[PDB]
């Protein structure tokens, strides 16, 4: 059927270069307005570049002089050549067919570009200990702080999967160091604090890091 | 006209008074290429072409050499070596209707760019995909023209503008379009340097006694010397007596 | 240039409701507007082009209208698959400008957050940094304000926060806020507190601890 | 694009041999006096090379 299949996204240092490809089926790239559109993590859509059926090309001001859009008729494929990449170029990049006025009806699934100076690093895992003052007949909160890792993602489980109810693992935030940080919390009955062991299991594949952190009430 | 079907007026065999154009305060765009606007009344050309159409204010910048965009690529294209003037003005008062004016169209789909001064009025359904269209609209099969939405509430860049493109053509043929080349008053009984229709000289012009024929212009003495002339405006014959001189 | 202001940023609706999203251009763009729908992790989907032409196959619910400077997307009867983020886009423009987007979320009743504060662990302090974490658990609606205080001084500029997506079971949110100090700064002050204001609380709730005291 | 190099585009008359003109007077391309104010038919005589 009609599909746009893009590829080429990767982790790359600032100042690096990267080419994205977008192979088309059901649509002829050379006969269409074809665009690249990107989406930074947690932000909205930003149009990047367009190539007209007649061959004219245009660019957003934020990428002008650094990106080049092109196509290969024999391969029915669109390209985005990126040079002098910056941290703010980090995004999912979609290729889309433009019906003419800017209204894009055919989109690809996107490919992910990450531009960063950060070194790959496994997280430290610190406990978020349950407070000494907890309601006697109520609920207590505890968790794990998964700090200073790169790149995304990490996975977190509790008691090797045996604890799932009440777990909240939050979206990571990007610190000004360029390293990610995240917390995973669970609410448990305060009565269970003395007898049930709670261990968060943290996995960070890029650093081959696996960490089990026992989270206990703090003693005076 | 709609820009895709731009209108061309061929101007020939006439005196062009360009003072009407560059002395008008009603134009927002008046850019000339390979020619000076004020110095245009002194030039003869073989043909002048006046192309006119309506586009967006956003798009007047595309009516120039070396531009790209939907208008330059697919509707009206000027050459790199263009010799002429591009004139435009806001026409939101005339070309926008309350519900939206749609009588103005532009070509949106074309497989390749127009050549300079090419005019494409095809309405063939455009094949954006693999399957042939056979003149039926649908997915990957689009009508090639699009309508402007000229409403008075549009921003300036989206309001209609009327454009006139003057092209000046200098071929190895007789030049038929020139500029006014006005004249002045004439004085008699005084040494003057004069330039009549095609001849120039120095001398004193005096009331004559000869009877030139209705078609005769320049007199001639026996020794192939200009003797009298017919004033182009006043039907009077003037004798040319060279100004006094002599040895000292 | 023409600035597209899309409002509201977040709107809560229920299944079967009539939803109205507004996109305002800084000046007249005729009918040159498109609407997109995007769900988490998926590419955007074109709903309406030219301000009032529903794209083929999009259900009859989605209705687009508006002219000049104010445009609206109307979902006549919201279905479960319509909770998503919606984007407007100026058409026929050199800039291809998008709106900021509107997230349509599942409406439910108000629920106050349970607030918890966590001191930095002794293991982290040995490394020279102190992270203080404030947790807001299972609340609705999403609008919540976390004010860090250190010896009663309101902290700003040294905290980051993160919100979960609506829980698949009870449609609440949870929030985590992390205050980061150096170990040196952390040890110059005693009282650490996060004050939470939320619609479900009659007055702001403060959880606090004293550095060094259990 | 380096625009530090300029060229004069207008002048009321052609330069005499070895004449040097560095004046920045506003060229009045129309019938309206400029009075040192640039605008329509009132141009800066210099233009930058691209
Ligand atoms: C030319 O015009 C003048 C006035 O402008 C008039 O007096 C004169 O008769 C005209 N000559 C001819 C031949 O028409």
XYZ file of C-alpha atoms and ligand atoms in Angstrom:
746
model
C 0.000 0.000 0.000
C 1.009 3.647 0.499
C 3.829 3.995 3.016
C 6.907 6.101 3.720
C 9.728 4.161 5.396
C 12.484 6.374 6.805
C 15.801 5.324 8.312
C 19.243 6.624 9.220
C 18.603 8.222 12.607
C 21.356 7.729 15.153
C 23.270 9.142 18.112
C 25.864 11.677 16.938
C 28.101 14.358 18.451
C 27.542 18.085 17.823
C 29.177 19.175 14.592
C 28.608 15.735 13.080
C 26.801 14.756 9.903
C 23.954 12.367 9.152
C 21.845 11.402 6.140
C 18.222 10.351 6.565
C 16.506 8.293 3.873
C 12.784 7.971 3.109
C 11.802 5.172 0.720
C 8.314 5.619 -0.733
C 5.691 3.215 -2.054
C 2.313 4.148 -3.512
C 3.540 7.725 -4.086
C 6.066 9.004 -6.644
C 8.532 11.237 -4.790
C 9.660 13.115 -7.908
C 6.052 14.031 -8.785
C 5.105 15.365 -5.340
C 5.760 18.053 -2.810
C 7.836 16.089 -0.289
C 8.783 17.433 3.132
C 10.730 16.583 6.248
C 9.093 17.453 9.573
C 10.648 16.937 12.997
C 9.455 16.761 16.600
C 11.786 17.376 19.530
C 11.130 15.313 22.692
C 7.968 16.603 24.328
C 7.482 19.466 21.854
C 5.324 20.171 18.808
C 5.810 19.747 15.083
C 8.406 21.773 13.164
C 8.592 21.789 9.377
C 12.184 21.355 8.186
C 12.494 21.249 4.396
C 10.546 20.700 1.178
C 11.370 19.787 -2.416
C 8.877 20.717 -5.130
C 7.956 18.322 -7.960
C 9.847 20.658 -10.301
C 12.931 20.443 -8.078
C 12.888 23.704 -6.120
C 13.901 23.341 -2.476
C 13.163 25.445 0.592
C 14.247 25.318 4.212
C 13.224 26.493 7.647
C 15.451 29.251 8.996
C 16.671 27.029 11.853
C 18.343 24.579 9.426
C 19.267 26.834 6.491
C 22.844 26.347 5.318
C 23.167 23.077 7.255
C 20.553 20.667 5.848
C 20.020 19.625 2.235
C 16.953 17.822 0.889
C 17.291 15.684 -2.236
C 15.730 12.666 -3.917
C 16.556 9.693 -6.138
C 13.983 8.969 -8.838
C 15.216 5.453 -9.640
C 15.000 4.517 -5.946
C 11.807 6.553 -5.320
C 13.533 7.841 -2.214
C 13.755 11.157 -0.369
C 16.862 12.231 1.542
C 17.829 14.710 4.247
C 21.566 15.395 4.467
C 22.408 17.053 7.790
C 25.695 18.836 8.518
C 26.968 20.780 11.537
C 24.407 19.130 13.795
C 23.458 20.802 17.074
C 21.850 19.578 20.281
C 18.590 21.301 19.337
C 18.395 19.159 16.182
C 17.514 16.207 18.442
C 14.093 15.014 17.300
C 12.054 12.365 15.575
C 12.221 13.139 11.853
C 9.233 12.361 9.630
C 9.021 12.470 5.867
C 5.615 13.472 4.551
C 3.840 13.995 1.246
C 2.494 17.529 0.865
C -0.801 17.789 -1.008
C 0.334 21.192 -2.306
C -0.698 23.835 0.229
C 1.177 22.394 3.215
C -1.513 19.877 4.216
C 0.404 16.607 4.593
C -1.626 13.398 4.312
C 1.018 10.639 4.046
C 3.528 10.341 6.892
C 6.262 7.879 7.697
C 6.800 6.323 11.101
C 9.794 8.576 11.782
C 13.442 8.025 12.646
C 15.109 9.289 15.817
C 18.121 11.623 15.795
C 19.996 12.396 19.018
C 22.747 15.034 18.991
C 24.726 15.220 22.222
C 28.221 15.636 23.645
C 27.369 13.369 26.583
C 29.317 10.182 27.193
C 27.360 6.957 27.528
C 27.039 6.260 31.246
C 25.080 3.932 33.509
C 22.890 5.383 36.236
C 23.502 5.652 39.908
C 20.491 4.289 41.779
C 19.678 5.966 45.073
C 16.858 5.022 47.455
C 13.831 7.178 48.173
C 13.266 5.805 51.669
C 9.777 5.606 53.217
C 9.256 8.369 55.764
C 9.465 7.451 59.439
C 6.174 9.325 59.965
C 3.538 7.351 58.073
C -0.152 6.938 58.811
C -0.578 3.848 60.995
C -3.546 2.590 58.971
C -2.607 4.273 55.715
C -0.209 4.245 52.776
C 3.543 4.832 52.557
C 5.547 5.950 49.528
C 9.021 4.741 48.590
C 11.028 4.583 45.411
C 14.305 4.785 43.530
C 16.163 7.767 42.073
C 17.847 6.760 38.796
C 20.325 9.571 38.222
C 22.912 10.622 35.617
C 22.634 8.150 32.736
C 22.937 8.440 28.965
C 21.457 7.770 26.540
C 17.808 6.859 26.947
C 16.225 4.537 27.925
C 16.224 2.777 31.277
C 13.708 0.220 32.472
C 12.655 -0.121 36.109
C 10.806 -2.967 37.815
C 10.031 -3.679 41.469
C 10.749 -6.972 43.257
C 11.601 -8.514 39.867
C 8.099 -7.850 38.539
C 6.229 -9.171 41.592
C 5.206 -5.583 42.485
C 3.232 -3.719 39.809
C 0.203 -2.179 41.541
C 0.848 1.418 42.567
C 4.105 1.820 40.627
C 4.766 5.157 38.911
C 7.941 5.401 36.830
C 8.226 8.995 35.686
C 9.468 10.398 32.367
C 13.162 11.169 32.525
C 14.317 14.780 32.544
C 17.399 16.014 30.709
C 19.674 17.769 33.191
C 21.927 20.661 32.206
C 24.836 18.188 32.370
C 23.358 16.442 29.329
C 22.598 13.322 31.397
C 19.127 11.964 32.102
C 17.550 11.451 35.518
C 14.328 9.747 36.532
C 12.489 8.415 39.572
C 10.305 5.361 40.093
C 7.959 5.265 43.083
C 5.434 2.861 44.587
C 2.817 3.255 47.308
C 2.558 0.331 49.737
C 0.653 -0.263 52.986
C 2.633 1.243 55.859
C 2.199 -2.017 57.784
C 4.347 -3.881 55.221
C 7.443 -1.710 55.779
C 8.910 -3.954 58.473
C 8.310 -7.342 56.859
C 8.201 -6.950 53.044
C 11.410 -6.249 51.122
C 11.217 -3.720 48.291
C 13.912 -3.755 45.601
C 13.899 -1.683 42.421
C 15.573 -3.355 39.435
C 17.198 -0.924 36.993
C 18.377 -1.901 33.505
C 20.372 0.387 31.181
C 21.293 -1.615 28.078
C 23.622 0.980 26.423
C 26.033 0.689 29.368
C 25.285 -3.002 30.079
C 24.225 -1.831 33.541
C 21.921 -3.875 35.779
C 21.350 -2.628 39.332
C 19.157 -3.907 42.178
C 18.626 -1.360 44.973
C 17.028 -2.453 48.234
C 14.884 0.403 49.579
C 14.499 0.269 53.361
C 13.267 2.579 56.127
C 16.079 4.763 57.407
C 17.264 4.187 60.972
C 18.292 6.959 63.360
C -6.072 37.463 -15.785
C -5.282 34.519 -13.558
C -1.513 34.155 -13.341
C -1.468 30.687 -14.920
C -3.266 32.121 -17.967
C -1.414 35.444 -17.902
C -2.367 37.997 -20.547
C 0.131 39.429 -23.036
C -0.366 42.689 -24.937
C 2.000 43.232 -27.865
C 2.832 46.935 -28.219
C 4.102 48.192 -31.575
C 4.288 51.310 -33.752
C 3.549 53.966 -31.147
C 5.178 56.648 -29.014
C 5.545 55.483 -25.408
C 5.200 58.132 -22.682
C 6.770 56.397 -19.690
C 6.361 59.566 -17.600
C 2.843 58.295 -16.858
C 4.303 55.264 -15.061
C 7.320 56.344 -12.995
C 5.594 59.593 -11.929
C 2.661 57.638 -10.449
C 2.379 57.299 -6.665
C 0.017 54.301 -6.948
C 2.579 51.496 -7.426
C 4.047 49.472 -4.567
C 6.555 47.607 -6.771
C 8.494 49.203 -9.652
C 11.726 47.286 -10.288
C 13.461 47.449 -13.667
C 16.188 45.141 -14.958
C 18.745 46.079 -17.590
C 17.182 49.527 -18.036
C 16.654 52.749 -16.080
C 13.019 53.858 -15.645
C 13.583 57.611 -15.931
C 15.926 57.086 -18.907
C 13.301 55.056 -20.811
C 11.833 57.921 -22.870
C 15.085 58.124 -24.879
C 15.148 54.487 -26.051
C 13.621 52.837 -29.105
C 12.744 49.142 -29.065
C 11.510 46.785 -31.755
C 8.663 45.416 -29.612
C 7.346 45.974 -26.099
C 5.347 43.291 -24.293
C 2.961 44.012 -21.413
C 2.138 40.890 -19.390
C -0.504 41.192 -16.671
C -2.035 38.913 -14.030
C -2.955 38.761 -10.331
C -0.991 37.068 -7.530
C -0.534 37.344 -3.773
C 1.530 40.109 -2.241
C 3.664 37.321 -0.766
C 4.496 36.317 -4.347
C 5.416 39.588 -6.099
C 9.006 38.838 -5.052
C 8.894 35.820 -7.400
C 8.319 37.988 -10.501
C 12.040 38.654 -10.923
C 15.062 36.963 -12.535
C 16.412 33.922 -10.727
C 13.486 33.294 -8.380
C 11.865 30.002 -7.403
C 8.489 29.189 -5.883
C 5.057 28.074 -7.075
C 4.555 31.226 -9.166
C 8.004 31.398 -10.758
C 8.246 27.637 -11.261
C 4.746 26.825 -12.488
C 2.936 30.025 -13.534
C 5.093 32.927 -14.781
C 8.860 32.720 -15.274
C 11.261 35.558 -16.107
C 14.643 34.821 -17.712
C 17.982 35.464 -16.059
C 18.874 38.077 -18.704
C 15.494 39.825 -18.363
C 15.370 43.335 -19.837
C 12.283 45.096 -18.542
C 10.253 46.334 -15.600
C 8.039 44.597 -13.033
C 5.200 46.794 -11.746
C 2.706 45.821 -9.040
C 0.090 47.389 -6.786
C -2.390 46.269 -4.145
C -5.841 45.484 -5.567
C -7.637 44.205 -2.458
C -10.380 46.757 -3.157
C -11.169 45.156 -6.537
C -10.188 41.480 -6.402
C -11.524 40.394 -2.987
C -15.178 39.541 -2.350
C -16.882 39.229 1.025
C -17.523 35.492 0.842
C -14.127 35.046 -0.791
C -13.112 35.611 -4.406
C -12.187 32.402 -6.222
C -12.100 33.554 -9.860
C -8.295 33.881 -9.594
C -6.307 30.661 -9.987
C -2.683 29.540 -10.033
C -1.073 26.308 -11.164
C -0.071 24.126 -8.217
C 1.055 20.892 -9.912
C 3.486 20.583 -12.812
C 6.112 17.927 -13.480
C 8.798 20.478 -14.390
C 9.485 24.197 -14.196
C 8.249 26.613 -16.820
C 10.651 28.054 -19.331
C 10.865 31.867 -19.420
C 7.685 33.448 -20.801
C 5.979 30.045 -21.045
C 2.192 29.954 -20.625
C 0.596 26.654 -19.555
C -3.209 26.559 -19.624
C -3.580 22.771 -19.429
C -6.242 21.407 -17.077
C -5.072 17.785 -17.304
C -5.454 15.807 -14.088
C -2.017 15.530 -12.497
C -0.604 12.055 -11.797
C 1.087 12.198 -8.387
C 1.429 8.415 -8.076
C 1.941 5.188 -9.985
C -1.550 4.570 -11.379
C -2.722 6.613 -14.389
C -5.470 9.155 -13.800
C -7.403 8.935 -17.110
C -8.813 12.400 -16.454
C -10.528 11.402 -13.187
C -9.763 13.111 -9.891
C -9.080 11.174 -6.716
C -6.160 9.982 -4.637
C -2.814 10.735 -6.323
C -4.846 12.356 -9.146
C -5.282 16.085 -8.612
C -6.746 18.950 -10.576
C -3.657 21.056 -11.374
C -5.029 24.535 -10.580
C -5.708 26.018 -7.145
C -7.841 28.993 -6.157
C -6.665 32.050 -4.285
C -8.836 32.898 -1.300
C -8.974 36.684 -1.652
C -10.985 38.042 1.272
C -10.690 41.636 2.544
C -9.697 40.390 6.017
C -6.448 38.864 4.726
C -3.066 40.174 5.757
C -1.182 42.232 3.197
C 0.927 39.296 2.009
C -2.271 37.360 1.233
C -4.167 40.203 -0.465
C -4.420 40.347 -4.270
C -1.885 42.354 -6.250
C -2.118 43.294 -9.916
C 1.160 42.879 -11.799
C 2.306 44.312 -15.129
C 5.592 43.091 -16.621
C 7.076 45.197 -19.416
C 9.572 43.349 -21.624
C 11.792 45.352 -23.978
C 12.938 43.561 -27.124
C 15.730 44.804 -29.408
C 15.938 42.716 -32.585
C 17.588 43.321 -35.952
C 14.313 44.798 -37.225
C 12.897 48.336 -37.368
C 12.356 49.820 -33.914
C 8.689 50.781 -33.602
C 8.294 51.778 -29.920
C 10.073 54.956 -28.815
C 9.929 57.700 -26.365
C 8.528 61.198 -26.615
C 11.591 63.291 -27.541
C 9.913 66.655 -27.009
C 10.985 69.904 -28.662
C 11.357 73.596 -27.756
C 10.674 77.034 -29.204
C 12.595 78.406 -32.190
C 14.256 81.821 -32.489
C 15.093 83.694 -35.694
C 17.717 86.279 -36.680
C 20.166 84.877 -34.104
C 23.033 82.422 -34.527
C 21.765 79.064 -33.224
C 22.975 75.469 -33.203
C 19.930 73.623 -34.532
C 18.856 69.993 -34.919
C 15.897 69.435 -37.233
C 14.217 66.089 -37.881
C 17.334 64.195 -38.913
C 19.881 66.920 -39.654
C 22.020 69.092 -37.397
C 23.986 72.252 -38.014
C 24.808 75.795 -36.978
C 23.396 78.936 -38.534
C 20.765 81.653 -38.523
C 17.182 80.723 -39.399
C 15.308 83.353 -41.407
C 11.913 83.707 -43.051
C 12.255 82.228 -46.525
C 10.991 83.123 -49.995
C 10.835 79.620 -51.516
C 7.805 77.392 -52.126
C 8.600 73.910 -50.846
C 6.358 71.073 -51.951
C 4.060 69.503 -49.320
C 6.422 66.509 -49.025
C 9.803 68.287 -49.130
C 11.685 68.784 -45.866
C 15.334 69.795 -46.392
C 16.620 72.232 -48.991
C 19.903 71.858 -50.838
C 22.122 74.316 -52.701
C 23.957 73.492 -55.933
C 27.089 72.345 -54.067
C 25.326 69.694 -51.940
C 24.896 72.023 -48.961
C 21.789 72.330 -46.797
C 19.996 75.572 -47.671
C 16.481 75.516 -46.185
C 14.403 73.325 -43.882
C 10.737 72.711 -43.114
C 9.932 73.254 -39.446
C 8.349 70.008 -38.162
C 5.605 71.760 -36.152
C 4.935 75.050 -37.969
C 4.395 74.664 -41.723
C 6.922 77.395 -42.500
C 10.123 77.144 -44.546
C 13.255 78.521 -42.872
C 16.377 79.569 -44.764
C 19.640 78.597 -43.071
C 22.237 81.352 -43.455
C 25.513 80.303 -41.775
C 26.546 82.633 -38.974
C 28.795 85.544 -39.873
C 32.548 84.977 -39.802
C 35.691 86.297 -41.409
C 39.382 86.910 -41.111
C 40.804 89.400 -38.635
C 5.093 37.316 10.335
C 1.906 35.416 11.189
C 1.811 33.780 14.629
C -0.542 30.858 15.292
C -1.869 30.818 18.868
C -3.619 27.533 19.683
C -5.821 27.341 22.781
C -6.272 25.641 25.095
C -3.027 23.760 25.761
C -4.924 21.037 27.640
C -8.637 20.263 27.648
C -10.467 17.503 29.511
C -13.534 15.919 27.925
C -15.665 12.804 28.335
C -16.576 10.111 25.827
C -19.447 11.459 23.744
C -18.767 15.133 24.474
C -18.635 17.942 21.921
C -15.104 19.370 21.845
C -14.021 22.761 20.479
C -10.361 23.594 19.812
C -9.417 27.134 18.766
C -6.536 28.300 16.561
C -6.005 32.064 16.224
C -3.773 33.592 13.551
C -2.196 36.994 14.127
C -3.831 38.179 10.873
C -6.120 36.988 8.090
C -5.244 33.684 6.408
C -8.534 33.230 4.516
C -9.270 29.498 4.839
C -5.616 28.357 4.657
C -5.634 26.082 7.695
C -5.142 22.373 8.369
C -5.743 20.227 11.454
C -3.743 17.194 12.576
C -4.272 14.495 15.200
C -1.338 12.769 16.890
C -1.328 9.998 19.469
C 1.711 9.163 21.635
C 4.453 7.493 19.617
C 2.585 7.783 16.302
C 2.925 10.028 13.281
C 0.424 12.886 12.893
C -2.760 12.217 10.934
C -4.359 14.780 8.624
C -7.980 15.448 9.619
C -9.148 18.582 7.771
C -7.588 20.777 5.094
C -8.639 24.230 3.863
C -10.396 24.906 7.194
C -13.579 23.036 6.224
C -12.763 19.926 4.155
C -12.709 16.741 6.226
C -10.035 14.451 4.801
C -11.354 11.249 3.245
C -11.944 8.463 5.752
C -11.868 10.668 8.856
C -15.083 10.014 10.836
C -17.935 12.501 10.599
C -17.303 13.611 14.205
C -14.384 15.875 13.291
C -15.740 19.183 11.976
C -13.590 22.111 10.876
C -14.812 25.655 10.321
C -13.791 29.271 10.714
C -12.559 32.034 8.436
C -10.247 35.027 8.581
C -8.474 35.116 11.942
C -10.318 32.601 14.174
C -10.548 28.902 13.317
C -12.033 25.945 15.177
C -11.873 22.163 15.125
C -15.107 20.585 16.366
C -15.384 16.938 17.407
C -19.143 16.439 17.503
C -19.092 13.176 19.497
C -15.781 12.245 21.119
C -14.944 8.535 20.941
C -12.311 6.634 22.983
C -9.768 6.863 20.141
C -10.000 10.676 20.006
C -8.015 11.408 23.181
C -4.867 12.748 21.537
C -2.960 15.924 20.714
C -4.254 18.164 17.931
C -2.266 20.653 15.847
C -3.270 23.461 13.514
C -1.049 24.501 10.621
C -1.091 27.649 8.518
C -1.388 26.662 4.859
C 0.054 28.390 1.788
C 2.804 30.089 3.793
C 6.558 30.372 3.347
C 6.987 29.372 7.013
C 4.736 26.274 7.331
C 3.852 27.471 10.821
C 2.294 25.032 13.302
C 0.228 25.711 16.384
C 1.407 24.746 19.849
C -1.014 21.825 20.015
C -3.994 20.873 22.175
C -4.028 17.711 24.292
C -7.523 16.276 24.822
C -7.602 14.118 27.949
C -10.041 11.926 29.859
C -12.351 13.864 32.166
C -12.919 12.595 35.700
C -13.719 13.965 39.146
C -11.300 16.034 41.219
C -8.789 14.121 43.346
C -6.301 15.698 45.730
C -2.678 14.505 45.575
C -0.979 12.562 48.317
C 2.242 14.482 48.969
C 5.546 12.902 50.012
C 9.013 14.431 50.401
C 12.265 12.444 50.323
C 15.645 13.650 51.633
C 18.847 12.859 49.737
C 20.266 9.468 50.626
C 23.560 9.238 52.476
C 25.009 7.361 49.492
C 24.340 10.280 47.148
C 25.709 12.828 49.624
C 29.073 11.037 49.597
C 29.238 11.892 45.871
C 28.881 15.636 46.517
C 25.305 16.187 45.283
C 21.946 16.272 47.072
C 18.686 15.520 45.259
C 15.505 16.297 47.215
C 12.380 14.719 45.722
C 8.752 15.784 46.165
C 6.059 13.368 44.975
C 2.436 14.221 44.134
C 0.505 10.971 43.758
C -2.758 10.216 41.931
C -4.340 13.631 41.444
C -6.743 15.285 39.003
C -6.825 17.623 37.169
C -3.225 17.943 35.965
C -2.795 21.595 37.003
C -0.634 21.517 40.134
C 1.920 23.892 41.645
C 5.003 22.752 43.581
C 6.909 25.417 45.536
C 10.234 24.375 47.047
C 11.312 26.152 50.229
C 14.721 26.027 51.923
C 14.756 27.692 55.355
C 11.543 29.406 54.166
C 13.158 30.911 51.043
C 11.211 30.150 47.868
C 13.464 28.227 45.475
C 13.309 28.719 41.712
C 15.770 27.709 39.011
C 17.195 24.583 40.692
C 14.319 22.114 40.253
C 12.935 19.963 37.441
C 9.656 18.073 37.324
C 7.988 15.290 35.377
C 4.356 14.198 35.040
C 3.066 10.762 34.105
C 0.393 10.135 31.529
C -3.159 9.605 32.733
C -3.361 6.306 34.600
C -5.109 3.675 32.501
C -7.282 2.702 35.496
C -8.273 5.856 37.423
C -7.252 8.589 34.919
C -5.185 10.455 37.524
C -1.760 11.996 37.096
C 1.301 11.797 39.297
C 4.113 14.337 39.502
C 7.726 14.171 40.666
C 9.805 17.264 41.461
C 13.549 17.120 42.130
C 15.477 19.897 43.881
C 19.210 19.609 43.160
C 21.865 21.238 45.345
C 25.543 20.673 45.919
C 26.375 18.912 49.172
C 27.950 22.161 50.393
C 24.781 24.197 49.807
C 22.555 21.424 51.189
C 24.479 21.510 54.476
C 24.052 25.279 54.936
C 20.297 24.971 55.578
C 17.996 23.024 57.886
C 14.347 23.020 56.760
C 13.491 21.549 53.355
C 9.881 21.656 52.218
C 7.665 21.429 49.147
C 4.329 23.271 49.258
C 1.648 21.848 46.954
C -1.355 23.814 45.704
C -4.076 21.991 43.783
C -7.809 22.285 43.181
C -8.483 19.275 45.437
C -6.820 20.922 48.454
C -8.700 23.519 50.497
C -5.323 25.055 51.416
C -1.751 24.391 50.240
C -0.233 21.235 51.737
C 3.395 21.326 52.897
C 5.560 18.257 53.496
C 8.936 18.996 55.065
C 11.953 17.570 56.866
C 14.896 18.903 58.866
C 18.360 17.990 57.612
C 20.017 15.594 60.052
C 16.891 14.723 62.051
C 15.340 11.320 61.325
C 28.025 36.186 1.562
C 30.652 38.908 1.954
C 29.110 42.376 1.602
C 32.096 44.471 2.733
C 32.876 45.412 -0.889
C 30.673 48.176 -2.286
C 30.000 49.781 -5.653
C 28.357 53.080 -6.555
C 25.120 52.522 -8.469
C 23.979 56.096 -9.219
C 25.581 59.466 -9.939
C 24.450 62.706 -11.561
C 27.306 62.489 -14.088
C 30.126 60.222 -15.198
C 33.448 60.445 -13.389
C 36.294 62.368 -14.969
C 39.584 60.476 -15.443
C 41.228 59.484 -12.140
C 38.403 61.225 -10.254
C 37.522 59.742 -6.860
C 34.067 60.131 -5.303
C 33.432 58.808 -1.788
C 30.420 60.999 -0.968
C 27.397 59.302 0.600
C 24.832 61.899 -0.510
C 21.387 60.408 -1.112
C 20.691 60.059 -4.833
C 17.324 61.562 -5.813
C 16.020 59.175 -8.476
C 12.736 61.081 -8.828
C 11.349 64.622 -8.820
C 10.865 64.725 -5.030
C 13.802 66.236 -3.097
C 15.204 63.789 -0.559
C 16.635 66.289 1.968
C 19.005 63.596 3.200
C 16.144 61.135 3.814
C 16.189 57.778 2.047
C 13.010 56.317 0.600
C 11.106 55.955 -2.647
C 13.292 57.355 -5.458
C 15.763 58.348 -2.701
C 18.566 55.791 -2.644
C 21.909 55.255 -0.973
C 24.369 55.519 -3.895
C 26.378 52.494 -2.707
C 25.374 48.834 -2.921
C 27.158 45.795 -1.519
C 28.581 42.998 -3.642
C 27.268 39.502 -3.029
C 1.053 70.839 -33.418
O 0.543 71.204 -32.124
C 0.420 72.622 -31.936
C -0.016 72.837 -30.507
O 0.614 71.914 -29.628
C -0.565 73.191 -32.954
O -0.645 74.601 -32.793
C -0.100 72.855 -34.364
O -1.067 73.290 -35.313
C 0.109 71.349 -34.508
N 0.617 71.027 -35.831
C 0.067 70.096 -36.618
C 0.721 69.892 -37.949
O -0.913 69.446 -36.270
